[PDB]
Amino acid sequence: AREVITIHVGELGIQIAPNFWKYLCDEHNIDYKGQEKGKIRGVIDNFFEKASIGKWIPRTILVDLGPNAIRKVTKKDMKDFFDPKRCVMGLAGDANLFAKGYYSYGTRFMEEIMDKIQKEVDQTEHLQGFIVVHSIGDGTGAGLAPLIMEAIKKKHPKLVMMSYSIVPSQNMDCSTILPYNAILSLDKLTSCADISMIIDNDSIYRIVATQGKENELSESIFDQVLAKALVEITATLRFNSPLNRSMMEMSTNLVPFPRNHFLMTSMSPLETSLTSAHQKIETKELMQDLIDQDHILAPITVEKGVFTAFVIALRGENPHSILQNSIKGFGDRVKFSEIFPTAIKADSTTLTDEKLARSGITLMNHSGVANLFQFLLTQFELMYDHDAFTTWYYQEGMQPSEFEAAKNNIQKLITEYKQDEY
Amino acid sequence: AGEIVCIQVGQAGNQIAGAFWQKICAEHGIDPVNGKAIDVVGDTDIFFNTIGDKYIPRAVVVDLEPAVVENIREKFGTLFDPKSIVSGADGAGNNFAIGFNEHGAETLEKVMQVVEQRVSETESIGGFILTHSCGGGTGSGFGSKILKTIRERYPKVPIFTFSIFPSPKISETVVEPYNAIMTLSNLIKYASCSIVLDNEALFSIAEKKLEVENPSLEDLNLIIAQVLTNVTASLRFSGTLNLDLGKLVTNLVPFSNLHFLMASTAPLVLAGKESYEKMTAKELSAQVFGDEYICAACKPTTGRYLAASVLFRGAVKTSDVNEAMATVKEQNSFVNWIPTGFKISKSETSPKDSALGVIMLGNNSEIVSVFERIGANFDRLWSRKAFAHWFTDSGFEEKDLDDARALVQKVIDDYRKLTEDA
Ligand SMILES: Nc1nc2c(ncn2[C@@H]2O[C@H](COP(=O)(O)OP(=O)(O)OP(=O)(O)O)[C@@H](O)[C@H]2O)c(=O)[nH]1
């Protein structure tokens, strides 16, 4: 078994954790507290550690500078699972600042964090990699996630590191300094992640609002969508998949030009409030949903821009004759840049989910990520040029040359992605 | 963690705060007569300590006059435990300089010993809140030295003040323009944020919205208490935006030295069950952002906002909130440097007197109208050395009050210039 350690950092990493881990538990027949039920199915070792007798342990670390995300997760949302021995808890907020988790406060925990990580590493014969789940734009996550990631890679350089970067939406709990924290942290992800997936909560919001369900939106719907995305993305690493049997393969399939590792994803079905009743999806429709605009959890349209890589990972019964004919319907939409002579890869793994006949996700390496970046960069520059809110970072140690450097690396990254279109 | 210590200084401070403490006790299911739990709800621990089944408000009660603090035992009684009650000598008053320099070395030390005790009992300080008069004697004099001292001892702990600016409609003690600037200067130098309330606005609100023919000091306090209660509420009762004091500074203060905030709340109720039916989001947002409910003598619709924060307390639909707030954005100008900065949040817990209440805070360039009037009153008296030697023998030199004015003028000038365009 090639195993993965999962680290949850900051508010979204930790608020997601209970949904993510509950879903995995059901997928493998783990009865929520680690108790085995029925028969274990899937490669359970990849995400759960063995108790001496029976019980399974999520292979996780929960890191939060403020005590609240962790306290409700371990006392109210999922008991006797996220063992306190593996929680790193601070006693102060970040005041939403990047700086706090990277330079002035979160740094005092790095001894503790790296010690706990090694303790997880030491229990496994074959690491495949690390996955760090975090909010981008929220100081604790924006700060610690790249601090942690960098510390790991200089110690375990041969492992693939993947991050799940969640961009806060404006109808949820965002800070007024979101644009600052966002590019200050993209700047570090660009130098430490091997694979980084960006999921935009504003698209989750837009899709649900489009459905006529905006008045039902709450943290729980966002957490369910985000958790399902993690489960499906990670799903091919939990079974005997034909597409991505390892994070090492994902790196090869998804990022052929190492700096451009930021990915966009899509899913179908989406289940707002879990009341969607997707009683039947035909194979042909599943692929059309995955390409269609309203299932992309990012502000991009597949009809614009270019692809560098595109992997369609389906679940359940998806005959290949249909998949191959269906893909031709993408002829006027899915265009790859002629710097990389690739093709759309598509195949499927099994479901242990009894409610959906079939489902699936896509991973896209697509130039449209540049538009998410440019939006944030424009906001950054507009605020930065008038020093709005910059004093708060300077007093924590962020010498202003740091802001200029972040601006330059993201403008350069944006330029490089758009260049693939010319 | 994220706990708040509250310091009440002077008469105005103790009466306003006393009213605050009674309202907050009601909301959290605490019987204010003795601190006993009724059915406790919300994040009680942010403002109350707990011993046994008694909730103890983490207040420091300060005056110079023996009687003012001693008589709290009759007005509020058991609500404020005696260990927090500090006063001394024979009292002092009606002169900033006296409160600031003649309070007694022992008097200030006792205040600080109590502050430290409240702090050591607390898991992690999220900030300090002070309630005080900006004029008179004790509230401005001793209160400003207290403000100064606290920041020196706790350099990174944000301090919020609720402060009351004087009005000639109420007080004949026209030495006040001197007191008003000396304390404003210290607020500029040491507070992280401050809520500018004044009695000219509160008085006219009482006359026109509470329908009081001749507002009493107690009606002014009623309105103030409602503002403090509902403003503070964003920190303590759930909510969709996950705020703390450090976070409020980050969201509402784009520049240091420009941290003076306006506050507005509605509906207002004249101390009885006058409330009726239910207000819609539209009429309620309109009141809050109108000039008529601003609790500072400003006319904010004519200015420009750097930032704003609007809390809806009660059962309001997301779609009505968003339509109502879209109307506000169209009608009241914002500085475009901040592409964000207007944060809307809601909390499911309504205030005790209504189905839905709305609270707004913000940075509006017209806030300086208060400061400009104070300056004018000061200039008429100051250019004539109205009261040089009084202040000369209490330890202040002309250069110090000139420094105070220079700083105040700098803030005024920066607000006018900063928001001139965008
Ligand atoms: N809005 C409001 N203003 C008040 C209240 N009490 C006093 N003030 C005003 O604040 C100023 C009085 O300052 P005080 O704080 O009373 O003076 P002090 O600090 O008690 O010490 P002395 O100056 O000795 O009384 C005057 O403008 C009062 O009208 C109040 O309850 N509400």
Rounded Cα–Cα distance for residues B62 and B10 (Å): 6
Determination approach: cryo-EM
Cα of B248 to nearest chain A Cα, Å: 8
Rounded Cα–Cα distance for residues B310 and B319 (Å): 15
Instruction: Kindly give the pairing relationship between strand B85-86 and strand B125-133.
Output: unpaired
What are the Cα distances from residue A396, in Å, to A160, A249, B342? 32, 40, 25
| Out of B247, B307, B318, closest to residue A96 by CB | B247
Find residues 308-327 of chain B whose CB sits inside 8 Å of chain A.
317-319, 322
Cβ–ligand 1 contact at B251 (below 6 Å): no
> Is the sign of the CA dihedral A83, A88, A91, A95 positive or negative?
negative
Q: What number of C-beta contacts closer than 8 Å exist between A and B?
A: 89
Strands (E) across A104-159 are located at 127-135
Rounded Cα–Cα distance for residues A222 and A173 (Å): 12
Residue of B nearest to A69 (CA): B242
Looking at residue A269, its amino acid is: P
Rounded Cα–Cα distance for residues A366 and A303 (Å): 11
Q: Which residue's C-alpha comes closest to atom 11 of ligand 1?
A: B136
Mutate to test the pocket of ligand 1, among B7, B11, B130 (most ligand atoms within 8 A of CB): B11
What token pair was written down for A365? 């390496």
- The label of the residue with tokens 């090694």 reads A118
Q: Which residues of A touch B252 (CB under 8 A)?
A: 176
Looking at residue A412, its amino acid is: K
Cβ–ligand 1 contact at B101 (below 6 Å): no
* Centroid of ligand 1 to alpha carbon of B179 (angstroms): 12
Q: How far apart are the first and last CA of chain A?
A: 43
Q: Which residue's C-alpha comes closest to atom 24 of ligand 1?
A: B93
Cβ–ligand 1 contact at B143 (below 6 Å): no
Cα of B250 to nearest chain A Cα, Å: 6
CB of B251 within 8 Å of a chain A CB? The answer is: yes
CB of B257 within 8 Å of a chain A CB? The answer is: no
Domain boundaries, chain A: 3-258
| Out of A67, A95, A178, closest to residue B340 by CB | A178
Instruction: Kindly give the pairing relationship between strand A358-366 and strand A345-349.
Output: unpaired
Rounded Cα–Cα distance for residues B81 and B94 (Å): 28
* Centroid of ligand 1 to alpha carbon of B137 (angstroms): 8
CB A356 within 8 A of CB A282: no
Q: Which of B136, B119, B191, B138 is nearest to B162 (CA)?
A: B191
Q: Within 10 A of A84 (CB to CB), how many other CB atoms are there?
A: 10
Q: Which residue's C-alpha comes closest to atom 30 of ligand 1?
A: B12
Q: Which of A267, A203, A271, A182 is nearest to A230 (CA)?
A: A267
What are the Cα distances from residue B390, in Å, to A356, B175, B304, B400, B405? 84, 10, 40, 14, 18
DSSP output for B21-50: HHHHHHHTTEETTTTEESS--S-GGGTEEE
Cβ–ligand 1 contact at B179 (below 6 Å): no
Q: Which of A234, A346, A366, A232 is nearest to A283 (CA)?
A: A346
Residue A197 backbone zone (phi > 0: left; psi -120 to 50: alpha; other: beta)? beta
CB contact under 8 A, A173 and B242: yes
CB A133 within 8 A of CB A127: no
Cα of A68 to nearest chain B Cα, Å: 8
Q: Which residues of B touch A174 (CB under 8 A)?
A: 340, 343
Q: Which residues of B touch A202 (CB under 8 A)?
A: none
Rounded Cα–Cα distance for residues A219 and B345 (Å): 13
Residue of B nearest to A383 (CA): B337
Cβ–ligand 1 contact at B15 (below 6 Å): yes
Rounded Cα–Cα distance for residues B343 and B364 (Å): 15
3-state class percentages of chain B: helix first, strand second, coil last, to nearest 5: 45, 20, 35
Q: Which residues contact B347 (CB under 8 A, 6 or more apart)?
A: B233, B234, B237, B238, B239, B240, B311, B312, B313
Q: Within 10 A of A179 (CB to CB), how many other CB atoms are there?
A: 24
CB contact under 8 A, B246 and A67: no
- Give helix B398-418 / helix B368-382 axis angle, nearest 10°: 150
Cis peptide before B300 (omega within 30 of 0): no
Strand order in the sheet with B260-266: B85-86, B59-62, B3-9, B125-133, B159-165, B193-198, B260-266, B356-364, B305-314, B342-347
Cα of A155 to nearest chain B Cα, Å: 33
Cβ–ligand 1 contact at B221 (below 6 Å): yes
Rounded Cα–Cα distance for residues B125 and A148 (Å): 26
Q: What is the DSSP letter of A158?
A: T
Resolution (Å) of this entry: 3.5
Burial (0-12, 13-18, 19+ Cβ within 10 Å), A248: middle
Atom of ligand 1 nearest to the CA of B92: 24
What token pair was written down for A244? 């991505």
What's chain A's length in residues? 422
- The label of the residue with tokens 């194979």 reads A283
What token pair was written down for A324? 């191959």
Residue of B nearest to A377 (CA): B339
| Out of B242, B340, B345, closest to residue A176 by CB | B340
What token pair was written down for A176? 């007024």
Architecture of domain A3-258: 3-Layer(aba) Sandwich (3.40)
User: Phi/psi of residue A54, each to 5°?
Assistant: 75, -65
Residue of B nearest to A379 (CA): B339
Burial (0-12, 13-18, 19+ Cβ within 10 Å), B384: exposed
| Out of A66, A219, A388, closest to residue B338 by CB | A388
Cβ–ligand 1 contact at B327 (below 6 Å): no
Cβ–ligand 1 contact at B138 (below 6 Å): yes
Q: Which residue's C-alpha comes closest to atom 7 of ligand 1?
A: B12
Among B338, B348, B414, pick the best mutation site for testing chain A contact (most A Cβ within 10 A). B338
Residue of B nearest to A173 (CA): B241
Rounded Cα–Cα distance for residues B30 and B345 (Å): 26
CB B265 within 8 A of CB B312: no
What token pair was written down for B90? 């024979």
* Centroid of ligand 1 to alpha carbon of B102 (angstroms): 19
Q: Which of B158, B198, B141, B63 is nearest to B404 (CA)?
A: B141
CB B370 within 8 A of CB B297: yes
Cα of A14 to nearest chain B Cα, Å: 14
| Out of B123, B244, B337, closest to residue A91 by CB | B123
Cα of A286 to nearest chain B Cα, Å: 31
Cβ–ligand 1 contact at B135 (below 6 Å): yes
Q: What is the DSSP letter of A245?
A: S
Q: Which residue's C-alpha comes closest to atom 6 of ligand 1?
A: B12
Q: What angle do CA B59, B62, B67 make, to 5 degrees?
A: 120
Q: Which residues of B touch A217 (CB under 8 A)?
A: 318
Atom of ligand 1 nearest to the CA of B16: 31
Q: Which of A106, A108, A105, A129 is nearest to A117 (CA)?
A: A129
Across A396-413, b (16+ Cβ under 10 Å) vs e yields bebeeebbeebbebbbeb
Q: Within 10 A of B299 (CB to CB), how many other CB atoms are there?
A: 13
